[PDB]
């Protein structure tokens, strides 16, 4: 084979590529916004006072005195750290109380609490779906769902965004492939992974036809309600209440407590038959510390406040209606979103050849708006990693706290700035 001498001199030649490629200095993501003080309404960004149009705080529960008082009481009781997984002396009583409160609020049997919003749906999917199964995931699915699907080794089939003709086409092709080989088709499970209200688009999924397709073609729906959990429906139970669909048809509803509840974490709710598997095969649950008690008590108090007065959902709905109606008329931009969606997008009508020019035009608009005391933000994606990479877009986020006058002024400011910059 090979003599020793050429082996050492081969080992000597080999020079590895550098660990990190040299990033360009003119990277907009490299410069971060330094938000002094709390990121509340009327914040201070980069030294300039700005009304907050960029933070996913739909109900305005981050700065509520009751939430802060409850978190302070729990902090005085238990402290800041849990110091262990949920299996090894890391399960406090507040964790169990919060799980029970979530299960009662969503009218289901069981709920499970994860310490990080990404990990809940990056770890729910790999637990149930294994190698050999089939997943019909929507095209415009957030990065967490994509990494969850990649972690498992199942066969991923991406259908067009909110297009049931494409889903039925894929399902029928799978029926044919099943009839080709029945013995394998007896041990293959079919999942439909959809999101209740997509972050990449701002549009809502049609559950009345997804339920019928699931019942006809022997599939199982995994729903991600992250953005629709606390905003949609009369009582804010998500998209299932908005459509009136029964809660039992959907198998696993996974959301995160960071957006509406304003406390770090995540949770998956469902029937005990589905949930109890995650307590042992969920990696983000078994192999990591539990949620700190103060955050759990803050989430419990937020759930109480959501249960007391359900009118904040109505006022958020009417503010979304007002801002969406006013934003019609931007010269150089188009609104991508719906009158119900809290957080929607502003994209470029006519895109230049390079994406970077679009990114920098939108950044110019964002900066000019910020100087005028309205703080916007641009949607940030990993260009190399996204399977379906959305167009660049400013992001407009609405909340019950912003007055009507602030909404009208935001609309007028964006109109003038966009007409000037796009000219």
């Amino acid at each position: 084979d090979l003599t020793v001498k050429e082996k050492e001199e081969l080992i000597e030649e080999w020079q590895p590529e550098p660990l990190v490629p040299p990033v360009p200095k003119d990277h907009p993501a490299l410069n971060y916004n330094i938000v002094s003080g709390p990121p509340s309404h009327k914040t201070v960004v980069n030294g300039k006072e700005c009304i907050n149009f960029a933070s996913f705080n739909f109900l305005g529960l981050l700065d509520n005195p009751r939430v802060k008082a409850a978190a302070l009481a729990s902090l005085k009781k238990y402290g800041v750290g849990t110091c262990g997984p949920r299996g090894f002396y890391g399960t406090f009583d507040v964790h169990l109380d919060l799980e029970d409160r979530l299960a009662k609020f969503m009218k289901t049997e069981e709920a499970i609490i994860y310490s990080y919003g990404f990990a809940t749906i990056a770890s729910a999917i790999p637990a149930y779906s294994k190698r050999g199964d089939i997943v019909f995931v929507d095209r415009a699915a957030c990065f967490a769902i994509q990494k969850g699907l990649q972690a498992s080794r199942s066969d991923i089939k991406l259908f067009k965004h909110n297009d049931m003709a494409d889903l039925e086409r894929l399902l029928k092709e799978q029926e044919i492939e099943d009839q080709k080989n029945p013995r394998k088709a007896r041990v293959t499970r079919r999942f439909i992974v959809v999101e209740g209200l997509y972050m990449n688009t701002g549009t809502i999924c049609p559950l009345p036809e997804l339920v019928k397709l699931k019942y006809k073609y022997k599939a199982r729906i995994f729903l991600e309600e992250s953005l629709s959990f606390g905003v949609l429906g009369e009582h804010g139970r998500g998209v299932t209440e908005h459509y009136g669909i029964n809660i039992d048809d959907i198998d696993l509803i996974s959301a995160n407590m960071e957006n509406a509840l304003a406390s770090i974490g995540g949770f998956c709710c469902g029937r005990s038959f589905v949930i109890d598997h995650q307590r042992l095969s969920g990696q983000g649950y078994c192999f990591s510390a539990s949620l700190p008690p103060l955050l759990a008590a803050a989430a419990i108090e937020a759930l109480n406040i959501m249960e007391e007065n359900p009118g904040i959902f109505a006022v958020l709905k009417e503010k979304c209606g007002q801002i969406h109606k006013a934003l019609q008329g931007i010269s150089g931009l188009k609104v991508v979103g719906e009158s119900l969606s809290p957080a929607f997008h502003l994209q470029l009508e006519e895109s230049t050849g390079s994406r970077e020019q679009d990114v920098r035009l939108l950044q110019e608009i964002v900066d000019q708006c910020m100087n005028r005391s309205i703080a916007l933000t641009q949607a940030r994606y990993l260009e190399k990693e996204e399977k379906c990479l959305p167009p660049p877009s400013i992001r407009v986020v609405v909340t019950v706290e912003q007055t009507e006058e602030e909404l009208e002024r935001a609309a007028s400011t964006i109109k003038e700035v966009a007409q000037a910059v796009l000219l």
Binding site: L2, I11, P16, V20, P22, V23, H27, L30, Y32, N33, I34, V35, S36, P38, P39, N52, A54, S55, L62, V67, K68, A71, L72, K76, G79, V80, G81, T82, C83, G84, F88, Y89, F92, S115, F118, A122, Y128, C142, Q150, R186, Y215, E258, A262, S263, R271, F273, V274, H277, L280, Q283, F287, S288, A289, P292, A298, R380, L382, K384, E385, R395
Partner: protein, 492 residues
């Protein structure tokens, strides 16, 4: 690879008769599990398990039976030793809520009584920062009053604050490296920054026993994964030589990069990694080093800067230094330290930097106060006392147990003390007999350890005064006499 101080570690071998009896016990459990499953299938016996809803019985079964075998027939019998609901601060003594099951551990009902003053040997506060009073708690209360609990947006967009920058610079000063970045979950740190560093066309050399986060992070990236024997430098050297020489598996081109994933202290084993030899082979073969210091960042070292201070080496030699604030500093989170080029590349291309919510403000305040206490910036001598007391506790406890006749693993300087039980009934028996005597211990078996080696891991702390250790040693001696847990040949 030069060790300034001696590097002695003992992993005594499994006896013969003990292995035989372990196998007999596992066989009996397997046969009776088959019998119970057979009775459950024919509906002769009522099952306390949820069944798929009637409208979904024609669907393909969600769980294949054999997949859950071990969970239903072995784990469920001794489930009462896990998920114990404490109801107080996990200091040296914790309050455990009492629960009992009439369905043989299928469902638990909480009785009124709460067990008070349980000696806690399962919590991770190595330096004893888990307290509900003190400077750290008051500072966290101030930050909670001002900033509020939780931030509502990603780091890149609007979720970056001033506290995060203060914490990052403080961490960079702490470790000694040029820059560092902070995340909200150590699991997320690994699983979201390993895929950014490497990709297809690179080799990842991972230890035999790595945390599930490192394995998941390696799997998510497309790099080829090769496993070398646990702390066996000959195997690492052979793998490095073969990888550099023979190149990629199919198209024998040279590797783009070679990355070595290692840990500071392996929690189950208790063994400290042979860092000087790892760095020697790294420099010789031009590899890159990823060092997870979750367990060693506050415990090991004369001033607790990690394992690099423990061995006395230079932090600039380690390419990427991961770490976690959960264990020692008493607040959830994670961090990565390295040169500024690496930190800028991560700040741009880290999955959690782009798509995940950042840390909470009270948590970062607690981490900052703990780090300032350790470094002596506070001006008071709490930082010096805790490390010395933890070292004294570790040496005393390991000496006393090794001289009673038990079998203990790992380097003599690691705080985690895995005592060894070796049988599937003794896993449950040890936990129950400890809890009857007011000691809380962590017993782990097949899912996290090899089947034959079933252990009871102790985690020492600076909170444990000498009286607490004396009481725990007396009760462990009594129980070991009761259960015949003294398998040591050499010492007695």
């Amino acid at each position: 690879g030069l060790y300034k101080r001696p590097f002695n570690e003992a992993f005594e071998e499994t006896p013969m008769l003990v292995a035989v009896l372990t196998y007999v016990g596992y066989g009996v459990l397997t046969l009776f599990g088959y019998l119970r499953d057979f009775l459950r299938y024919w509906r002769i016996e009522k099952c306390h398990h949820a069944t798929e809803r009637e409208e979904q019985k024609d669907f393909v079964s969600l769980y294949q039976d054999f997949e859950n075998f071990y969970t239903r027939n072995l784990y469920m019998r001794i489930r009462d030793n896990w998920n114990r609901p404490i109801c107080s601060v996990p200091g040296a003594r914790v309050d455990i809520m009492e629960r009992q099951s009439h369905d043989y551990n299928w469902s638990f009902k909480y009785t009124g009584n709460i067990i008070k003053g349980v000696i806690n040997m399962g919590s991770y506060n190595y330096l004893g920062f888990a307290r509900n009073t003190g400077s750290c708690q008051e500072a966290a209360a101030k930050v909670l009053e001002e900033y509020g609990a939780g931030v509502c947006s990603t780091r890149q967009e609007i979720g970056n604050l001033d506290k995060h920058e203060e914490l990052e610079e403080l961490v960079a000063r702490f470790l000694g490296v040029e820059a560092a970045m902070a995340y909200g979950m150590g699991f997320a740190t690994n699983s979201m920054n390993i895929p950014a560093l490497v990709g297809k066309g690179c080799l990842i050399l991972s230890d035999e026993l790595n945390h599930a986060s490192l394995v998941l992070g390696a799997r998510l990236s497309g790099a080829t994964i090769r496993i070398f024997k646990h702390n066996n430098m000959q195997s690492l050297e052979k793998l490095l030589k073969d990888a550099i020489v023979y190149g990629q598996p199919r198209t024998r081109r040279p590797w783009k990069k070679i990355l070595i994933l290692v840990e500071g202290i392996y929690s189950m084993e208790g063994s400290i990694v042979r860092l000087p030899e790892v760095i020697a082979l790294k420099k010789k073969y031009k590899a890159y080093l990823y060092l997870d210091e979750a367990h060693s960042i506050g415990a090991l070292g004369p001033t607790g800067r990690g394992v690099v201070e423990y061995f006395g080496l230079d932090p600039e030699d380690v390419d990427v230094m991961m770490g976690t604030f959960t264990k020692s500093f008493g607040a959830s989170g994670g961090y990565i330290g390295g040169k500024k080029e690496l930190i800028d590349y991560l700040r741009t291309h880290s999955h959690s930097a782009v798509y995940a919510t950042s840390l909470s403000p009270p948590v970062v305040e607690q981490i900052i106060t703990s780090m300032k206490c350790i470094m002596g910036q506070d001006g008071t001598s709490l930082g010096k006392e805790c490390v010395q007391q933890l070292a004294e506790n570790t040496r005393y406890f390991r000496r006393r147990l090794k001289e009673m006749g038990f079998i203990i693993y790992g380097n003599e300087d690691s705080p985690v003390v895995p005592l060894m039980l070796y049988m599937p009934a003794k896993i449950g028996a040890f936990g129950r007999e400890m809890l009857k005597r007011n000691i809380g211990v962590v017993v782990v078996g097949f899912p996290a350890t090899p089947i034959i080696e079933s252990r009871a891991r102790f985690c020492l702390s600076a909170a444990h005064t000498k009286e607490i250790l004396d009481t725990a040693l007396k009760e462990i001696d009594e129980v070991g006499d009761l259960l015949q847990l003294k398998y040591s040949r050499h010492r007695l």
